[model samples]
Target chain A: KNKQEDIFDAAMQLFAERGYDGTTIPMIAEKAKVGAGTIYRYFENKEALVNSLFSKSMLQLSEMIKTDFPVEANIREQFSHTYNRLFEFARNNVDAFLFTNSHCDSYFLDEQSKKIFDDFIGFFMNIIEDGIVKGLLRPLPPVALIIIVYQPLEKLIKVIATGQLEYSKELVKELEESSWNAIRII
Target chain B: MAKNKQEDIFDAAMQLFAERGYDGTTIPMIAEKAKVGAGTIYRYFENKEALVNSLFSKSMLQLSEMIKTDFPVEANIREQFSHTYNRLFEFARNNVDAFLFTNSHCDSYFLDEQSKKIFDDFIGFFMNIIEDGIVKGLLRPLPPVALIIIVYQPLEKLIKVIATGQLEYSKELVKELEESSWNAIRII
Candidate 1:
């Protein structure tokens, strides 16, 4: 009944762990519980499928950032809202985050796919630019400020996902403070 | 004579690896990018396996050389950080490909034992400096590794922009970045 919907979730996790070459259409079929021909009936080929997943993933990630944004809140609240979504996505939307991170640099990704990824980052770029103009954040490049907040948080996800490290409740708030220290004007 | 060709191949491989990553990247592609025959690639590197490991080692070695300068033990942690930050980005400015490739592929599946260990030691050196700062209560009390990534990871992003000329070069800009980075680790 939910065959069409089930295929994507099944395909996404396999693709995240195994990568583009390692994943096969037949594998997606068994995991998805659809016949092998069912996938091609819906899509042309594997590359097209991965591209669709990535482009859609970017939209969802963009949605997470854009929707319910702290528009009226101060800059500090705005950052915490955005940063909190990242940590929430790690817990709530696990495979999507991993797939996007792993395949953003994939050779098979389309030029448009790359643009969508950049557009998602651009969401934060605009926010950082505004913060600097208001004389709240450091007056470095907006891109640099984006990196300051996102990069280590991105790395923290990788370690937590792999069981290399786990976050304590206190550690979470501590990082928020330390990361804010990086970009906020003293 | 052909060590020059070796350098070209290294430059090309790093760019491709950083762009396409390892599994998707091929020798013929790197050969074409390097302007060398496919056989010429094999001449310098026994195979892709051998090629990536050697590249990884040299990348770490170059980073080590750029960073391990005169130990100003007398100088405070703040001064030491400025020195390290200055030297690290100087390497990034000079060797864009190596710096980007070293970072983008750090978690790669194909990296060998030697490549892996050298990278661990590379970060360890800086963590040693950071730990001292924490001990003396000059830097904020965070996990040692957390403190390093708070600054190092952002600079990694900084390199990607400068590589494509998205950011301009200026001495004042560099000094400001150093100050902002110190602001990150220093206690308020």
Candidate 2:
């Protein structure tokens, strides 16, 4: 378990710094401070290592969103809570957030990770479905609604993460509201 | 004729970057595609980094110019928003390679300070219109940067998808996209 954590941390940092293609398993082993042979003992190969990292990150992200979600609140409030939680996740867990966000569609992730992502999408769509049923959200398809709001927030966070823009509390508030307005029944 | 060579280089770079990304492309590849000697590229730009910066700046400036036409400073927010959206739609269709390269390779190491500003200045210009809309009570009171993200991010992704042959661009799709964006930020 301890060695696995070390390898995971090393891989995440390298994947964040150099993209997936640029980073090598030996590089991860060196960063993990483990021998090259040790990496193979835990994971099959570089692709396996990438899938492990991606799966762990996706699971963590899903749990992060679920941990403090305001389930009792109305759909509108839930949307706001979800949006804020996403930004908070990005701010606090910079490397993991960037890795999961950037590598979501990488062909490297295994079936388990892909299923986890599919479930995450299903969870979000359920929320949109509830909102539509209650007449609180737009009747647009879930995918369109998700892209219209989520992709923008994703890019905005990338802008802040990459130093293209600054972040602030007020800005967070505006982001939440803008994202809410985009999908809310107007 | 001298300027034609530069334009040729820009087109070649755009196509290469869009296809292979920033790291995968090389100056010699660009020169071969442009039908110019490797030396000719150095004559026009200082290095590979310089050529990329030049191409990025030129593409951004072209996009900026497109967004500024008939901007409707005195009109309602919806009309102004549609004009901006339509301009981007047309630009993406007409300049597929440039649009893809500019949006996808934004974080490339080859981009320099001057190249960065050309992109930032364009964002700043777009921000001004959002600010104006907010001040006029025509748009939601979201922060300017947030508004910019909400409006442009989805459009950028849709453009890329279309450019990559994943989606088809049609008048109906454009109207739907424009309306979806306007709905997000319009005063409701």
Candidate 3:
């Protein structure tokens, strides 16, 4: 592999292993088999590398969701699919998901990196808002209800998926439905 | 202050910080207000953040463990749920900083993982009971994790309102809210 791609791949692996705070350019160089200067030749610094990695992962997830969105299904089926999609993605990619959502509080995340999160949340906001306007759901303020409903469940599921608690696919599906019930008219 | 020095220091620091903030309180000021020697502070904790985290973590640990200590597992699910939740509220009532931690964004950050873990452990116990009920066909088909979060988030949120003294929380209102949560995912 080329030096730049080698550094990127190596950095991603270590970033996952050591976390943002603990990982350093020197460490990445050692792991990548490149010198510190060679590592910087591609990415300016550790922060820049983190920003690139974080944003790329987020953008990739967003694109995957966009591609996988169930277009032909009814509203309920669509909602269920969307919810499950996000949850399944998170379950399988717990480290990347958790690190981006909760652990990557370093100053490295630039405006665009942060916007990816805002955009992810905004996707849900639009879904809830659309459901309400179409009279398919309750009229709760989308943002407040989102935090009240989604935040805790997300945290709990992440904790469970991280091997902290035992869970099953059936439990995950039930969670999505329960979350749906709170906002649906039925 | 002789016997109650730790409690005194915790209470004093919490009150001062609640009235001002963590950054506003100095170690010397805390010592003076709590009527303890400066060196004595080190006997309990390493520094201010450690003190705050410990005090906060202990309050949370107590809030959850109190349920296990006081409320036996043999109790009915509905009763046990409310009893545990009430204990949590009362624990918050006991520690003003805990009330703040629940109400504000302070405990929502990185350093508060232990506090969040305390919450997860507390809620997990409740969820386990709910799952047992589901196994008996006494509960709904919903996910225990989701149902529990839905059940407890409003109660926790309600505690925040009641703590500020802005809203009066009637037992009747809490009952309705709790039942609404139960019924939300429960099949008839």
Candidate 4:
């Protein structure tokens, strides 16, 4: 597990640094401090590696949002809960976040890879869907609302990752408040 | 311009670059996507860096020109904010590939000084508006960079979502989102 974690950490760092096609197995090995043969043993090729990485990161992300989500909470509480989890996930897994987003629809992604992503986000979609039906949220498409609530994290995460924005409880709460205001009824 | 084949090359390049990025995309990949021979691209673009820099320069300028039109410098910050939001989203909707390509590759290492200058100057326009907004107590008190991130980043993703036809573009949605975006950075 140590060796495997080392390999994944190095591979993810590189994939986030350079796009999938731009990275090589030898480079991953060098970064991982292992033999290139070790990578081949774990995965057949670059495509397989990226697919596995995607599913792993995605499953982890899905679980973060899914664990203890307040199923009976009203839509607003549910949103605050979901956004905070997402924020923490991105903050803790910046490499994974960037890696998955950059390669979401790449040519190398197989159907299985795509479905994993679909079902992962579908959980959030169903939440938003329920919100709309219950008259707790606007009648926008679930995908658009998802972007409204989730996509801004792409930049806030980057700024925090890049040291452009200092991390604080205040900033995090402000972000949640800002996002909630964008989608809620006045 | 490859005897007026530049349009196809630009179209293909924008899609490829937006998808794969500068280091990831190869000349041959672009040539195949552009449906031009490898030699044909060189005749027009000289090298991969040159081709990308040229495309980046033009994309920034096109956005600048489109957004700059009828910009209400005389109006209050809220009105200015609405104008900028609608203009930027309008351009994104109309030129999805170009907008995505420009943004997705805006920070590429391969971009030259002139390309960087164009981008900075283009973003400068938004910065000026945001600066005024902050001082006038109309926008968030955060750094302009933070403000841009809060307001601009999600909308970029929203456009990407709309481009996929997950939701059709309409004035109602546009106004709704414009308000949403304004609320994100506004001093409420």
Candidate 5:
């Protein structure tokens, strides 16, 4: 377990710096200050190393949200806190976030990770679904409405973090509001 | 006068290729459509493909700028987000050529990698802003970069619909889209 933790920490540092492609297991071993063979004691290969990181990273993220979420708040507040936490986690872990996206072709994560993601957001989705059920959210399919709000803003923020454009605090709020309005009922 | 003619042809081509894709379009078609001499286009562009790539680069440059149209940094995070998104949508809506071609044939469309990096850099701008917002507690806690992908997909998909002629923008639908988007990521 300690050996795996070393591997995870070393891999996370390197992946965050050079991205998934540029980092190597040998490099991770060196950084972890362990022997190359010692590294594989925890996982099979580089992909495995990254998958472990992703699973762990997402687990922590879900934990943070679940830990901080205030359930007793009204539906609007509950939904807002949920999205904000998710976005905040993404922002704080920009490297991991971008690494996850840029290597979407590489990561081929198992259903377990996929399920964790869906399950983490299941609450948010259910809220929107419930909103529709109770006449709070718009009449559109919760899924469609979810995509409509999520898809564009998520893409825009990735572009911003990767140096595609100059940063503006104002633009982020604008996007957030734009997303919220899109999902809320008229 | 010659420059104006060239710009006119380039503009016409931007609209056509973004909507039609590269193979679906032809140089002669652009010339005929632009009402300029087939030879005149050659004066400005090396060939059909060159024109498309140039348009692709220029449109992205323009898109980076458009994301901030009417932007005021002093506004709250929500207003800023709303303004930026509407600006991007309006840009895509108003400048069909810019949005359509840059996104539609991106994967297969070859450019010098440096040029591709420039395109990627344009998207990075939005990512940075979202990160800042998250740090300040103005936005939600998600992977800023991944959230950018999530947020922009609908708009990109909308542009695709326009390119393929599957959906036309109606004012009401556009409003619905913008409003729905705002609700999805905010604390409200």
Candidate 6:
């Protein structure tokens, strides 16, 4: 189990630093300080390893955001809570965050992993749907609304994580309001 | 050896980068495609890193300039954003390679300080417009950078989908995108 954790950590770091196409299984084995055969003892091959990592990361994200979800709050406040939780998750787990946010679709995740991802997105879509039904958000296509609000948050997280941009309380609040405003019907 | 050869090199780099991404492309590949010797490329750019930086900065500046052409500075925030969005749509239609290359490899390690500054300056231009809109009560009371992201992230994704031939671009779709983008930050 410890060896598996090491492999997963090493793979996330390498896959985040060097993209999925650029990273190799042997590199992960060496970085994890495990024998090459040890990897296959657990997973069938590179694709399997990637899918496993992806599923674990996706579930981690879902678990992080869904924790203490403000179900009783109004949709607007709930959206803010979800947004902040996402930012917090990205900040706390930079490698896993990068692994999940940057490479989810790069590697061909297995059907199970894809379902895990879709479930994570579906979690956010529920908030969006409630907002639309409340007439607080524009009646845009749900996917388009999600893209408008979600992509910028994801991009901002990447920018802050990579140190291309700095992070601060003011910046976070600004992003939250801006993203909220983007989808909110005036 | 003429100046047009420089343009030829730029064009070739953009196409190759779009097709093969930054790592998969090589100096030799760009040279052959440009019909110039590898040494000629070196004369124009210091190295592969420098070459990519030059292409990236040029494309960024080209995009900035394209969106600003006859921009409706005197118009309202909605009109200005629509103008900017339409200009961006036109740029994607006309310069698909440059659009893809610039947007995809935005934060490459190979980008030098000068190249980075060109990109930064372009972003600053948008920031200025957003700030102006906020001050004039035309836009939402959010930070200019956040507003910029809200508007452009979706725009870039849409442009990419169309560029790769996933979605067909049309006059009506362009207008729809423009309105959708404006509504995102408009004070409505």
Best by DockQ: 4
Cα shift from native, residue B176, model 2 (Å): 3.8
Q: Write the per-residue lDDT of candidate 3 for residues A1-186, one digit (tens) a residue.
A: 487666767766776676556788998899888889977776888878777767876876687677768777766887777667777667766656766665344566788888887887798788879877998866545654464455556666665865655668887666666666655665
The docking quality of candidate 1, as DockQ, is 0.57
lDDT per residue for candidate 3 within B1-188, as digits (tens), equals: 45646778888787777666677787778888898898999888788877777776676567657667768567776677667666655665456456555334333443457766776776667778888888987676656755656666655655565666755656564554445455455554
**Which residue runs of candidate 6 sit more than 4 Å off their true CA positions?**
A1-3, A17-30, A33-38, A67-74, A122-136, B1-15, B31-58, B76-78, B104-121, B131-144, B164-188
Could you tell me the lDDT of residue A158 within candidate 6?
76
Candidate 2 lDDT, B102-165, residue by residue in tens: 7666656778998888887777776887888789997877668767778778777777666667
**Residue-wise lDDT of candidate 1 within B13-93, one digit each (tens)?**
877876687777888999999988999888878888788888888878987887786756688888889888988889888
Tens digits of per-residue lDDT, candidate 5, B60-167, equal 778777775567789876777778878888888877656755665555546656558877787677677788877887656656644555556777777666656656
Candidate 1 per-residue lDDT over residues A23-139, each given as its tens digit:
999999999988889899987888888888778777877787678998999988887777777777665666767777767888889989999988887777787888899899888
Tell me the spans in candidate 3 whose CA falls farther than 4 Å from its real position: A1-19, A71-74, A103-106, B1-37, B42-128, B140-185
Tell me the deviation in Å of residue B87 in model 3. 6.9
Candidate 6 clashing pairs, residues 3+ apart or interchain: A186-B188
Question: What ranges in model 2 sit over 4 Å off?
Answer: A35-38, A66-74, A126-136, A139-141, A163-170, B1-12, B31-54, B103-121, B132-143, B164-167
For all candidates, state DockQ relative to the true structure. 0.57, 0.48, 0.17, 0.59, 0.25, 0.37
Predicted chain B of candidate 1, TM-score versus the true chain B = 0.91
Q: How many clashes (backbone N, Cα, C below 3 Å) per candidate?
A: 0, 1, 0, 0, 85, 1
Candidate 6, overall lDDT?
0.78
lDDT head-to-head 1 vs 4, winner: 4
lDDT of 2 at A84: 84
- At residue A100, give the lDDT of candidate 1: 75
Model 2, A1-186: lDDT tens digits are 889988988988887689778899899999999998999988889898878877877777788889878998988788877888778878877777777887788778788889989998899989898887988877665666777877887877777887867889987886777678777776
Model 2, residue A161: distance off in Å is 2.6
Error of 6 at A40 (Å): 3.8
Please say which candidate is ahead in TM-score: 1 or 5: 1
